[PDB]
Design a binder for this molecule. Structure first.
Ligand SMILES: COc1cc2nc(-c3cc(F)ccc3O)nc(N[C@@H]3CNC[C@H]3C(C)(C)O)c2cc1OC
Ligand SMILES: [Mg+2]
Ligand SMILES: [Mg+2]
Ligand code: NA
Length: 266
């Protein structure tokens, strides 16, 4: 039914929707075996959806990396926006995690090495993602498994001597400085990553609360945070998690330490 450049899809083939996007499966019109996902406006939140998809194009078209979902093409118009992306045939990390419950340290390591590779590119380009969470990490069996960071609608460029202050992201993964409406930088993404890794290890968030507001109050009242790391956790992973899940961004692990962390060694 619908064409976007050299690609096509039908709205019969719904992959899913959230508040700000609807995704369909599609294919290249010449090479029918090249599958794609086609992200489109969610007209129920039309203005915001259109803004986020346009922001996502602006970032994603600058990123070419095996562990960042590839933007094959896009189409922006006054009243419509489409992104054509590589199809990730494994679904997302949230569904994988819900199934497996918890992952081994070896799997965590493989996934985190890949995420770290993506984060190296973002950091070199001066981009912060701002919505890292398992729902935005996709799995692809190209036959060995690749993780792919997705959903760059909240991402922005942040000049290295500046701070961001837009309240955006998902509260369960937000760095304390973000949810407390303070200024933040690229280290806020490292907290989100710490939370993802913790959740993979344990099956829960390190700091649980009834609501975003309760989570905020928790971080406000607690001047140090110590997540509970299971006794059987390896020493490198314990160390990595404690350094990532530091309440205060000035004490939090920085990118150079993260990239070169012993836990990530082969
Ligand atoms: C193979 O199975 C699946 C493939 C999927 N591919 C993409 C996908 C999304 C992209 F942006 C780019 C390429 C892709 O492949 N996204 C999915 N779900 C998205 C991602 N997490 C939230 C969810 C949604 C629809 C609310 O956004 C998939 C879910 C799947 O199974 C449930
Ligand atoms: Mg984003
Ligand atoms: Mg910060
Ligand atoms: Na760039």
């Amino acid at each position: 039914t619908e064409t976007v450049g050299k690609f096509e899809f039908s709205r019969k083939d719904l992959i899913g929707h959230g508040a700000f996007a609807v995704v369909f499966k599609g294919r290249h019109r010449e090479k029918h075996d090249l599958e794609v996902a086609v992200k489109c406006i969610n007209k129920k939140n039309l203005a915001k959806s259109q803004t986020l998809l346009g922001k996502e194009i602006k970032i994603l078209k600058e990123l070419k990396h095996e562990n960042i979902v590839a933007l094959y093409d896009f189409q922006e118009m006054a009243n419509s926006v489409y992104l054509v992306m590589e199809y990730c045939n494994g679904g997302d990390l949230a569904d994988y995690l819900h199934a497996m419950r918890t992952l081994s340290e070896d799997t965590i390591r493989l996934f985190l090495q890949q995420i770290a590779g993506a984060m190296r590119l973002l950091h070199s380009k001066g981009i912060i993602h701002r919505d890292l969470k398992p729902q935005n990490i996709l799995l692809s069996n190209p036959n060995s498994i690749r993780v792919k960071i997705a959903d760059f609608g909240f991402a922005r460029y942040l000049q290295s001597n500046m701070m961001a202050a837009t309240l955006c992201g998902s509260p369960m993964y937000m760095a304390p400085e973000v949810i407390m409406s303070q200024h933040y930088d690229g280290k806020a993404d490292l907290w989100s990553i710490g939370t993802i890794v913790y959740q993979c290890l344990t099956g829960k968030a390190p700091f649980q609360a009834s609501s975003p507001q309760d989570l905020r109050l928790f971080y406000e009242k607690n001047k140090t945070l110590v997540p509970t790391i299971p006794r059987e956790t390896s020493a490198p992973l314990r160390q990595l998690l404690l350094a990532l899940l530091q309440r205060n961004h000035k004490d939090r692990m920085d990118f150079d330490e993260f990239f070169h962390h012993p836990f990530l060694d082969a």
